[PDB]
Amino acid sequence: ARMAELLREKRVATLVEQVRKAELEHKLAQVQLQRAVRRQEELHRREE
RNA sequence: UGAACACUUUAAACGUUGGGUAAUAUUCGGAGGAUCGGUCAAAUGAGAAUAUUCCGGAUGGAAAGCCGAAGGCGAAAGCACCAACAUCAGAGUCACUA
């Protein structure tokens, strides 16, 4: 039971956290970079 | 997926308020003196007091005649005078939400 838990559960869960967090860092690099410069240029040109 | 924002685009979507109309029968005076109505066809009547009509006037509300279409909007029934109030809705782009 301890072999199953510490040698499966925490590392398979760890795979799930780091995979969705690499995905979240992908989505967050998107929403910072392309979104932020696009919308500040749009708001800049719309107020001009 | 579902929903709110910023743009692009949509009309017979929805209720209220003001105004209009080809057209409608009734009526006030005038033209005109026996036809009109109507149907496969025939039959009460309008009419010898003036009928269809025609002139021009009033009335008052129906319905929106063409547009307009195997076109649109709608959840469906449905929705076809504008103008404005007005509350939406639906589609596309670009972003939020996880």
**HSE-up of A27 (CA within 13 Å, CB side)?**
6
User: What DSSP letter does each residue of A17-45 carry, written as one string?
Assistant: HHHHHHHHHHHHHHHHHHHHHHHHHHHHH
Resolution (angstroms) stands at 4.2
* Protein-proximal positions, strand B, CB < 7 A: 94-97
d(CA A21, CA A6): 22
DSSP state of A9: I
CA→C1' distance for A12 and B81 (Å):
73
Cα distance between residue A48 and residue A5, in whole Å: 61
For residue A1, the 8-state DSSP code is -
- The set of residues with CB closer than 7 Å to nucleic strand B is A 31, 34-35, 38-39
For the CA atoms of chain A, what is the radius of gyration? 20
Give the distance, in angstroms, between residue A18 CA and nucleotide B59 C1'. Answer: 88
CA A14 from chain centre, in angstroms, equals: 15
Q: How far apart are CA A43 and CA A48, in angstroms?
A: 8
The total number of residues shown for chain A amounts to: 48
